[PDB]
Amino acid sequence: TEFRVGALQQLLQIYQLTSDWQKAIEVAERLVKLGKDKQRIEIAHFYCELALQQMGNDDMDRAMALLKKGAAADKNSARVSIMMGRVYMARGDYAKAVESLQRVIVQDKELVSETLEMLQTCYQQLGKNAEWAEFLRRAVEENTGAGAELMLADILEAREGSDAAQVYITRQLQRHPTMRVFHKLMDYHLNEAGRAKESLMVLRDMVGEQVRSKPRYRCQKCGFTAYTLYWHCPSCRAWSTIKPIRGLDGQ
Amino acid sequence: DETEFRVGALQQLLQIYQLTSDWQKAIEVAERLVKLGKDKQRIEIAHFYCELALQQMGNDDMDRAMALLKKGAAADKNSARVSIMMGRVYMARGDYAKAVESLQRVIVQDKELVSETLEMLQTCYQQLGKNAEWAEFLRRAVEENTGAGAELMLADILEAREGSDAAQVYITRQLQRHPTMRVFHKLMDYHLNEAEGRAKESLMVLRDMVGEQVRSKPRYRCQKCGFTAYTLYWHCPSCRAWSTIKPIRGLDGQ
Numbered sequence: 001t002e003f004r005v006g007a008l009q010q011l012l013q014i015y016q017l018t019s020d021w022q023k024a025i026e027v028a029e030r031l032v033k034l035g036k037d038k039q040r041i042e043i044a045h046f047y048c049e050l051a052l053q054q055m056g057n058d059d060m061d062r063a064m065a066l067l068k069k070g071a072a073a074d075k076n077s078a079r080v081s082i083m084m085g086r087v088y089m090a091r092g093d094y095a096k097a098v099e100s101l102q103r104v105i106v107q108d109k110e111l112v113s114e115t116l117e118m119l120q121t122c123y124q125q126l127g128k129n130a131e132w133a134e135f136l137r138r139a140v141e142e143n144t145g146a147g148a149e150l151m152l153a154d155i156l157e158a159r160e161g162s163d164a165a166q167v168y169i170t171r172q173l174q175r176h177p178t179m180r181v182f183h184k185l186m187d188y189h190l191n192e193a194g195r196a197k198e199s200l201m202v203l204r205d206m207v208g209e210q211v212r213s214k215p216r217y218r219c220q221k222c223g224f225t226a227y228t229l230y231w232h233c234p235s236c237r238a239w240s241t242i243k244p245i246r247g248l249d250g251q
Numbered sequence: 252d253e254t255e256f257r258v259g260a261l262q263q264l265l266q267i268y269q270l271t272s273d274w275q276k277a278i279e280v281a282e283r284l285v286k287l288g289k290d291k292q293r294i295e296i297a298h299f300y301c302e303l304a305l306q307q308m309g310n311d312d313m314d315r316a317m318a319l320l321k322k323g324a325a326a327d328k329n330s331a332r333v334s335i336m337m338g339r340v341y342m343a344r345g346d347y348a349k350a351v352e353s354l355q356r357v358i359v360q361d362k363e364l365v366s367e368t369l370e371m372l373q374t375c376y377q378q379l380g381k382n383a384e385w386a387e388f389l390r391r392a393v394e395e396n397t398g399a400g401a402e403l404m405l406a407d408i409l410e411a412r413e414g415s416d417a418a419q420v421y422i423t424r425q426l427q428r429h430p431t432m433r434v435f436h437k438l439m440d441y442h443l444n445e446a447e448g449r450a451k452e453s454l455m456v457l458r459d460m461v462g463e464q465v466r467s468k469p470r471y472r473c474q475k476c477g478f479t480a481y482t483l484y485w486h487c488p489s490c491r492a493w494s495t496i497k498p499i500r501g502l503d504g505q
């Protein structure tokens with residue numbers, strides 16, 4: 001309908017700036033039927049933002065209703081799976097929280113790293129700590145990143161000591177080299193007491209400065225970078241474009 | 252119009268000829284588009300010549316290749332690839348004086364490719380006995396942030412005069428001013444050199460792991476499509492662009 005699509009697109013952008021998510025859905029729904037299948041992705045995020053402000057009213061069940069509408073809009077949205085997970089955890093339904101959250105593996109494998117702080121407090125309190133270490137082991141070799149590698153490395157330093165963990169990360173750091181796991185060299189720093197002990201911790205600190213100063217996430221549209229995760233990019237105003245930085249300088 | 256139709260047909264011939272490595276036929280079509288007003292083709296014309304000069308360099312015909320390179324220089328005054336290939340031609344003919352001249356034109360044509368000229372220039376300056384001027388060129392190159400290759404080159408030269416310690420404090424300075432895994436790797440070698448006692452074994456295994464990443468990581472990336480490569484490809488196998496592959500800058504690279 002020519003100029004009418006332009007007016008909707010503007011209205012759609014302005015309604016997100018004014019954090020008017022319900023109005024943003026109305027405009028986005030019209031664009032979906034006008035041929036803009038890409039706004040399907042953004043409608044699910046709008047239900048996620050609506051649900052977020054329903055959680056601030058404690059109406060956790062109305063929030064869960066918004067998330068199911070969001071899942072209806074985007075089956076592949078990993079954000080709805082994470083938020084439905086937080087709900088099932090709030091209710092103590094730790095089994096259903098693992099059934100979602102693990103949906104992220106099929107939805108966006110670059111975001112499985114985000115479901116690991118939860119799913120840990122889910123396997124714990126479900127009584128399945130051994131099944132958890134198997135999940136991490138199957139996640140590290142599936143290449144989830146330095147996050148899963150170090151969560152697994154912690155479990156072993158407590159089950160089998162500081163010596164069997166040093167030999168573990170050495171093998172994994174070959175298979176998947178990353179500067180963060182190399183920093184875990186403290187394992188060598190637990191020994192060695194001469195002139196080189198005073199030569200090795202200076203090398204570690206150099207690595208340590210880079211581990212904390214280097215950003216953790218980058219937008220795939222523009223170059224935006226941050227230490228935490230954003231669903232909406234504060235530079236190009238896109239959705240689902242910020243993923244963890246994969247590489248030596250990252251995870 | 253009738254001219255816009257003919258332009259579109261030349262572009263189709265130029266595409267088919269690039270794709271078949273028919274550089275001679277590609278130059279003919281490209282020269283026609285230049286006549287019509289598409290001057291940006293002169294960039295593709297110089298690469299077409301450099302592909303031909305690469306054919307003649309494979310038959311030890313340095314005079315035929317240098318003739319083609321002069322034609323490429325005439326099409327593209329700014330092609331840094333021409334300057335480098337004329338360095339290889341002068342150097343095989345023993346003309347090390349002229350080799351420095353064309354290789355150094357890269358500083359103007361494409362500052363991101365100067366690191367690709369350092370090893371031949373180091374060879375040109377030792378053959379002329381101008382090893383002291385090479386050091387001055389390198390200090391200027393390190394300060395203009397040419398890369399870890401220049402930083403490491405200057406660090407061997409700084410050892411050939413004042414040894415360790417003196418070269419180390421320079422590297423630790425450059426490492427802080429410009430962190431790279433590669434320079435970090437060299438800093439590790441300075442810390443075990445003249446420093447055995449079961450901690451060297453701890454450091455030596457860490458230095459190997461770093462060096463294992465230095466020898467095996469790709470150093471080049473296409474700026475247009477992000478394709479990475481171990482060699483400097485002038486024609487990007489992925490997106491087929493010309494002179495988009497540059498050395499990877501950063502921690503992962505120079």
Ligand SMILES: [Zn+2]
Pocket residue numbers: 219220221222223224233234235236237238241
């Ligand atoms: Zn962005």
Ligand SMILES: [Zn+2]
Pocket residue numbers: 473474475476477478487488489490491492495
């Ligand atoms: Zn490319």
